[PDB]
Amino acid sequence: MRECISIHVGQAGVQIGNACWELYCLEHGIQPDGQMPSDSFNTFFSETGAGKHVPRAVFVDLEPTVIDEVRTGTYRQLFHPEQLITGKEDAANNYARGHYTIGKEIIDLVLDRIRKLADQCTGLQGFLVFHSFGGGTGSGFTSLLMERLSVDYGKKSKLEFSIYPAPQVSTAVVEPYNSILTTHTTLEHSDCAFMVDNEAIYDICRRNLDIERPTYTNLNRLISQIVSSITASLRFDGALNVDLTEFQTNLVPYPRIHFPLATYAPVISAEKAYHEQLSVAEITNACFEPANQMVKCDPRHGKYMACCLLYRGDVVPKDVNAAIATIKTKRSIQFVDWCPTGFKVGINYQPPTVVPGGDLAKVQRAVCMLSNTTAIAEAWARLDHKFDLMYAKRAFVHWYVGEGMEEGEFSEAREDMAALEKDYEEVGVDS
Amino acid sequence: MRECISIHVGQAGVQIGNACWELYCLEHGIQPDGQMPSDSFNTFFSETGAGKHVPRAVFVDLEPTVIDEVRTGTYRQLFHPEQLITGKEDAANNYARGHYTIGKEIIDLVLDRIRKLADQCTGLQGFLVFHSFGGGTGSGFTSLLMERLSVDYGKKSKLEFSIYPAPQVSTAVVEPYNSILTTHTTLEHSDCAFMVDNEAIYDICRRNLDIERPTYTNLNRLISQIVSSITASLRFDGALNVDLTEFQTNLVPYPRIHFPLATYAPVISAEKAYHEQLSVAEITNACFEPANQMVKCDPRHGKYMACCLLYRGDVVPKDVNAAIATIKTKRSIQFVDWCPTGFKVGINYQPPTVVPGGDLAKVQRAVCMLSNTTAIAEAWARLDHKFDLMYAKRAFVHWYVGEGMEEGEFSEAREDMAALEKDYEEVGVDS
Amino acid sequence: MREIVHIQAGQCGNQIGAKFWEVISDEHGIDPTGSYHGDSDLQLERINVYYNEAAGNKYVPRAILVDLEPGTMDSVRSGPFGQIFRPDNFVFGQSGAGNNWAKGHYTEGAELVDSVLDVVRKESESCDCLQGFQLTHSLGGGTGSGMGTLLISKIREEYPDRIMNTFSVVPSPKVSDTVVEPYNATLSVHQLVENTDETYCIDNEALYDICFRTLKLTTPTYGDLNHLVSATMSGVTTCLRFPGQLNADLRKLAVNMVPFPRLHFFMPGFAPLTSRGSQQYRALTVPELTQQMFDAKNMMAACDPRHGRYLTVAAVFRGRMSMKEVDEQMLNVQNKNSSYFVEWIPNNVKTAVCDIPPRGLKMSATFIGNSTAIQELFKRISEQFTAMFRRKAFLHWYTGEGMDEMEFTEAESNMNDLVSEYQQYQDATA
Amino acid sequence: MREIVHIQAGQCGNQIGAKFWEVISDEHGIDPTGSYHGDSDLQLERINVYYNEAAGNKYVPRAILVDLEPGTMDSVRSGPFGQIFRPDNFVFGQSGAGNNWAKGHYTEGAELVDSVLDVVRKESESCDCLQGFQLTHSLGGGTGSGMGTLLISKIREEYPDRIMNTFSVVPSPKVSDTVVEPYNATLSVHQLVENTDETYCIDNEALYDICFRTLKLTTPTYGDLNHLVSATMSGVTTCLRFPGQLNADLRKLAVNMVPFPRLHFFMPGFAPLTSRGSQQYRALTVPELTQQMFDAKNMMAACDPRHGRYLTVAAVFRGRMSMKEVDEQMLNVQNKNSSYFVEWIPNNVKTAVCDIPPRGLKMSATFIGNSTAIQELFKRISEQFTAMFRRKAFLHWYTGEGMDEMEFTEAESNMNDLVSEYQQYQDATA
Amino acid sequence: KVQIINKKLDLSNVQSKCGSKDNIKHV
Amino acid sequence: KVQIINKKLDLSNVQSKCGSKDNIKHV
Ligand SMILES: CC(=O)O[C@H]1C(=O)[C@@]2(C)[C@H]([C@H](OC(=O)c3ccccc3)[C@]3(O)C[C@H](OC(=O)[C@H](O)[C@@H](NC(=O)c4ccccc4)c4ccccc4)C(C)=C1C3(C)C)[C@]1(OC(C)=O)CO[C@@H]1C[C@@H]2O
Ligand SMILES: CC(=O)O[C@H]1C(=O)[C@@]2(C)[C@H]([C@H](OC(=O)c3ccccc3)[C@]3(O)C[C@H](OC(=O)[C@H](O)[C@@H](NC(=O)c4ccccc4)c4ccccc4)C(C)=C1C3(C)C)[C@]1(OC(C)=O)CO[C@@H]1C[C@@H]2O
Ligand SMILES: Nc1nc2c(ncn2[C@@H]2O[C@H](COP(=O)(O)OP(=O)(O)OP(=O)(O)O)[C@@H](O)[C@H]2O)c(=O)[nH]1
Ligand SMILES: Nc1nc2c(ncn2[C@@H]2O[C@H](COP(=O)(O)OP(=O)(O)OP(=O)(O)O)[C@@H](O)[C@H]2O)c(=O)[nH]1
Ligand SMILES: Nc1nc2c(ncn2[C@@H]2O[C@H](COP(=O)(O)OP(=O)(O)O)[C@@H](O)[C@H]2O)c(=O)[nH]1
Ligand SMILES: Nc1nc2c(ncn2[C@@H]2O[C@H](COP(=O)(O)OP(=O)(O)O)[C@@H](O)[C@H]2O)c(=O)[nH]1
Ligand SMILES: [Mg+2]
Ligand SMILES: [Mg+2]
Structure with missing residues (x-):
């Protein structure tokens, strides 16, 4: 297959x-x-x-x-x-x-x-x-x-x-x-x-x-x-x-x-599993909070272009639809205007498996969330800034040049990165 | 629900x-x-x-x-x-x-x-x-x-x-x-x-x-x-x-x-419980003594504006009506003229539960009373008086100011309290 | 959590600190080797306020040893509870102040303050959420007064938002242990009034009176006096270590006891104090503790509160009791003694209750009063200072360290202004 | 797979090498007879980095012993751990340099360097994948400095793509062991700055300070100093012999620590260092190790980093840990001391973690810092050089071997240029 | 040589905020 | 006698590469 x-x-x-x-x-x-x-x-x-x-x-x-x-x-x-x-x-x-x-x-x-x-x-x-x-x-x-x-x-x-x-x-x-x-x-x-x-x-x-x-x-x-x-x-x-x-x-x-950017839910410990019921709506909500994203960037600083949800285990499609609708109505999250439909969902029957001796509790359902957002643009900018700080004085450049990397390549990369940043700024503006 | x-x-x-x-x-x-x-x-x-x-x-x-x-x-x-x-x-x-x-x-x-x-x-x-x-x-x-x-x-x-x-x-x-x-x-x-x-x-x-x-x-x-x-x-x-x-x-x-103001009845000890066959009318009477109020102020100094009664347990609506009528006809208490109907009454089946190790005996009926009265105005006045006694010499004021609170705020608060006192004396006058 | 760094300077500071740490270790059930042999979880629940836990079930007190001569802390190290302290916290010079404020503040202190500050910073950064600093010293000595003022100023510059508390042995009114104590006392208060959040005043003469009159002790030594001072310290700082129905920390006491920034000189007291033979004839009840605390004879400072009027009062009860009784006693005291309280402050009394019974008896209570009568002490010192400054006696001893008469004039003027404030805050004007 | 060749020259080099090999043999469970007697497989999986295997389980350290006089290596051979070294690796002359850089560089070196080159070539042919060379010597000595520079130049001509590390002993700032120490020192760096990939600077004065102040050693001997130096040496290269969460070899350190080809002088440090009694008073945690890193008194060179700005820093930890704790400590150190780091290098810190701790310890820590403050050292040396070069003192000794004053002038000018570069790289310019 | 900051605090006039008197003239 | 190795680094003008603006004129 x-x-x-x-x-x-x-x-x-x-x-x-x-x-x-x-x-x-x-x-x-x-x-x-x-x-x-x-x-x-x-x-x-x-x-x-x-x-x-x-x-x-x-x-x-x-x-x-x-x-x-x-x-x-x-x-x-x-x-x-x-x-x-x-x-x-x-x-x-x-x-x-x-x-x-x-x-x-x-x-x-x-x-x-x-x-x-x-x-x-x-x-x-x-x-x-x-x-x-x-x-x-x-x-x-x-x-x-x-x-x-x-x-x-x-x-x-x-x-x-x-x-x-x-x-x-x-x-x-x-x-x-x-x-x-x-x-x-x-x-x-x-x-x-x-x-x-x-x-x-x-x-x-x-x-x-x-x-x-x-x-x-x-x-x-x-x-x-x-x-x-x-x-x-x-x-x-x-x-x-x-x-x-x-x-x-x-x-x-x-x-x-x-x-x-890839997140996951529910990430909870063994003792707090008893005090919480892991329902579809609440884990869907938790997938969208900035405190759960596994890249240090705030989604609220940008707009989502596309979102993908993957559910495992005991999951009912009507609950998935209701939770996605509720997320859509909420104004805490932003979506680009040129993407009226911004969700792709998948549902699977196999629940997650807990590795023995691990740290995650046993649950019957889980969500994996991927988002393509302009909030990552900031991160790019930061990296570029650091590059500039270390390239205005040619620091560490000789190490790379001695291995066959021509100097102009660095400039090329920086130029390309700048263009990429511009790209995001172009698509983050509504019409 | x-x-x-x-x-x-x-x-x-x-x-x-x-x-x-x-x-x-x-x-x-x-x-x-x-x-x-x-x-x-x-x-x-x-x-x-x-x-x-x-x-x-x-x-x-x-x-x-x-x-x-x-x-x-x-x-x-x-x-x-x-x-x-x-x-x-x-x-x-x-x-x-x-x-x-x-x-x-x-x-x-x-x-x-x-x-x-x-x-x-x-x-x-x-x-x-x-x-x-x-x-x-x-x-x-x-x-x-x-x-x-x-x-x-x-x-x-x-x-x-x-x-x-x-x-x-x-x-x-x-x-x-x-x-x-x-x-x-x-x-x-x-x-x-x-x-x-x-x-x-x-x-x-x-x-x-x-x-x-x-x-x-x-x-x-x-x-x-x-x-x-x-x-x-x-x-x-x-x-x-x-x-x-x-x-x-x-x-x-x-x-x-x-x-x-919140009160409660009956408040008795276990020993005195056996010598008093507690009834609805007597509990309703007990809820109106100044000595049973849970705020150290005399309701006889002011006039009620609204009263709320909440009954539990073995309670008959006709007895409730009779007791409330008797309370109304008793002229030792007063009601504002502009509130001819000054009672709300609710009844619940479940009697109160006695916590073991507690100090209240077991009863089959209980009353919680909440009264909005002008007699509380005196309390405000007293507080305001104390504030003035402490504010003429600006005692302890630096402690509050050093945390960013501007001094003029104090004035506003005091002035507001004055208005509130006036408010009460405006509605405690019949017409 | 809320953690306290403890500083001791000079002979008196080192001795009182040694006794205080022995008292605390016994209260928390720690053997002299530093290994916990307690019997309750509450002893270890809040051990971090005073102790740092090292590897292998050992607890190191968060204390600093400061002195300009090695004899006192050598005695501390060689004696019992000497191996509990970390050796690196022992800071000593080689000269000594010699009862000279200038020598300890400008010449030897200048050399030692850098190392002391480095150790203090190392202790502080190892903490989680520092609550404040606590210092123990006297005012009639050279090393204690000079280095204490220097360290207080430097720390206040370093951490302007933390809490500074001091236990200062003020000079006694009748018998003086040094000839030049007025100079040092004035030059120390001139800095305390500006750089210290609050200060408790203790007089050795009053403690002698307490042991001879109340405790029926024939031959009091400095051991008993430091025992009493340590008991007061533990009673003060008990709400940070054990739970209670109503608890109060250092900042709460400072807020509730300091009406103005220049009035932070309190008089402490402890109850119950009784002899071995009289403990069989009296009953430990809340009214008895309250009556003992509000007693002129029981004060730990040689000032009569009946001469002046209280500004604020703090009562830290300990043990199991009923706060209805506590409040009824407070009300009775306030109504009976209404001539001893300022009119421009209602509710002079703040109360706190710690559930854990004092190591000792069933119930106990600490008293901290902010009375205007303490101005007498300052006033008395003023007289002596000027009586010795007109003739310029002993002045060369100080001016040979770079100081000048301008500093003496400034100190006396500032502290006379403080005396005027304390005295004329006894006017109702309403 | 990555194997390292070790070279020692002069008395300093031979002593440090003997101590280093004793420590290494103890770590890998090798008895002085050369027969493995360990208790773990990790000691043998990466034994070939330092030890060749002979017939019959015997292990021969991959080391070379070089001196211009036989006394030191005779002491080494007759002492313990003298039978591990293969006798063919002991190279010696019969004259000795006598603290003369010219004698050890141009006359005796010309005689011994061919034999030493034969030995290194024979060792490197048995090498499978050579990682680089490591050299131990001192700058203030004759044969040390001269032969070290000569060998480094010859090998850099031989294998230019390999790695050179040197553990030099730069002269002390207060007390000097040799009158002609400046001359030689300068004539050494003028070679090192052009032929060495990276170099760690060691001061005996700093080691004495560490031993007396931290280890509480009353009578420190050269044995203890070489003990500390060998501890640092083993800490540097631990990632080549044991697995860890984050690995780092010599080339990685050279890339991360040398921003420009002329600035490859670092100041090493080690942690934890405690006495026989104080170790019970303090915890073995990552924050403690990190605080012992960035201590002006813990550095192994007599230069205060506070006077300058760090360029890069490496922290190599040993033992089981938590990576999050390490990165949080690095972040805290960078944030608090943000005035000690160049603005044009974000993320000055490189981190490595190794699972296996030193034998008998829970965790350890090695610090490497590339600080501009090192220029002070160079400056001081330069001053002394010219202070003696204007009067032409001791010059006939060197000029009687073939050199001329132009070489001295060139070395002085290059030293001045290096000092100027180090000073110039403290400018923000943005 | 120091006088305290004694302020002549007074609430001369304050007007009620409740609108109870608005419809007192109603028929 | 030596100078810091410094260069005038700048990104004067960079244009976006994705063609999202091409069809905005479509009816
Ligand atoms: C046999 C017996 O029950 O006697 C008691 C006792 O109740 C008496 C005599 C104790 C006793 O105190 C004195 O003898 C004493 C003498 C001079 C100065 C100060 C105290 C006691 O030592 C005090 C001691 O108190 C404690 O349990 C605490 O540990 C106490 N700590 C220490 O005394 C101590 C001494 C050395 C090392 C470590 C701790 C304490 C007190 C206040 C705050 C914290 C701790 C107890 C059981 C007593 C004796 C033994 C006689 C008293 O103790 C205090 C300060 O509350 C004296 O005032 C009370 C009156 C009591 O009647
Ligand atoms: C009970 C206990 O803790 O014993 C320790 C010890 O007391 C102390 C003081 C040891 C001891 O070290 C010294 O006394 C010392 C003296 C001069 C210079 C340097 C060290 C110790 O000798 C050192 C020795 O350490 C080791 O065994 C390491 O593996 C070390 N190896 C050697 O020192 C060594 C000794 C003889 C032969 C071969 C090696 C090592 C360190 C770094 C890298 C590789 C190896 C041990 C555990 C101790 C003693 C015996 C007292 C210390 O050693 C180290 C670097 O771990 C000094 O700083 C630590 C702190 C330790 O607490
Ligand atoms: N009736 C009742 N009153 C309480 C109780 N606990 C505290 N209080 C009241 O609380 C007042 C003290 O203030 P706190 O409640 O401790 O103040 P806080 O909420 O802890 O906030 P802080 O002032 O910062 O400590 C006292 O006057 C008590 O009357 C309680 O259990 N029952
Ligand atoms: N999440 C996670 N990150 C890791 C792990 N191991 C290394 N990293 C990351 O890898 C970075 C270091 O680069 P490495 O991936 O180790 O470099 P390398 O793959 O070994 O390649 P070389 O540099 O040539 O040795 C660190 O910043 C870490 O964040 C890991 O086990 N888990
Ligand atoms: N209560 C008490 N007072 C002390 C103690 N030791 C010294 N004093 C007082 O401190 C004063 C002497 O100050 P001292 O500490 O010797 O000055 P220093 O040595 O220069 O710091 C004297 O008036 C003593 O009364 C003590 O253990 N307890
Ligand atoms: N740390 C350490 N330093 C040493 C040792 N032996 C010599 N030195 C230093 O090396 C310098 C002398 O160099 P030396 O080896 O005698 O010169 P050489 O004869 O030309 O090799 C002195 O400044 C010493 O401080 C040692 O065993 N340990
Ligand atoms: Mg509170
Ligand atoms: Mg790698």
């Missing part, structure tokens, strides 16, 4: 992929050794040998430590040994290294592995890519890989779950350079990009889950929950099914505006 | 709320954990989970001490954790701190919780607010909350349970400032405001219950019994139901005169 291929690159991508594959194995009842103790999961797992299910995944990094952690973990006997590809020297937070110097050494091997995995599929629908903007390997190799993919396939859809840089929290100094360069070179080679912020997830964990020590495991578990809710309609059946193509058809009004 | 929301502010409000919710849970047969051991109580409790009932209550204070007392008491698992909102520093008997400097920090969160609770109700009709004039957090934050509620809603009723300062007993030096300021601010935002007086309840407990050590538990139990008698018409069906709107339609003749 329809098959999806997952690619995880860099430290963030690899760890998010680990969490995602643990979640899939738990949801489908597959043991960590590839055996089923007791079948629509052909979308993600292929059958090899006698009852062994191998995930359709590719794990790429230029540094072997995190992949080595994978190879010795609980899921050692789950992944194909050749699907875990490693380099020797990482990009070292240098976009040019992961794009021009180090990326080109293993890009061909990665493409060969992807082709071998894809030729098996008969109904391939698209690619899932997990990476981060700030990292060198992430941004550089992801940009190179998507350029190669768009050249090779073109028609198949390509999706990203990227980590947007936080407004205040940062873990690198060269972050704006890499972010701007990779956004400029990936703007024309993508179909939909869902972005999350570590700071926003920290706020979510502190405010709702009541966790004071949210390590990266919890963040990756939340992200994996969102990805699972996105792919559920493929992996199961419901009253209203949505595949990957409908996402880009409904959320992307123009080819240069494909940066929606 | 019809829903009500209870708001408790400050130390006094929170303690009264705890007593009231214990009484409600006992009345409706709800265990302290929220379960039921065996339904018109959707007005106050909302259903959730598997047969768990969550009160529609919000607890607000600027100091965590009393809310933490609640959070570890017997009813810890009854209240929704997000409904107990705490600050970090209290107003410290400062109106300005609770209204301008400190209150504005959590007013937004309180309003967010309020609207989240309100959207859950389909037929919400009003809010109940419990607070104290004398305190800083109580008066200031209550005024701010009433301002915000009136702006946001406007049409829903807003009833008030407030602790009027006692004429002799005092527990603070800055009571007149806070009382005058909060009365000036809230004079045009409260639909109706009943009052209780700690000195009067002390007197009641001494004279009637034969108690010489009345801790605040006894006073809060009395107040809870009164509010239960007020809301029983909503919570139970009776021969003559009274809503929340009927109170204000029947007891407030002008928008600026909405300060009734």
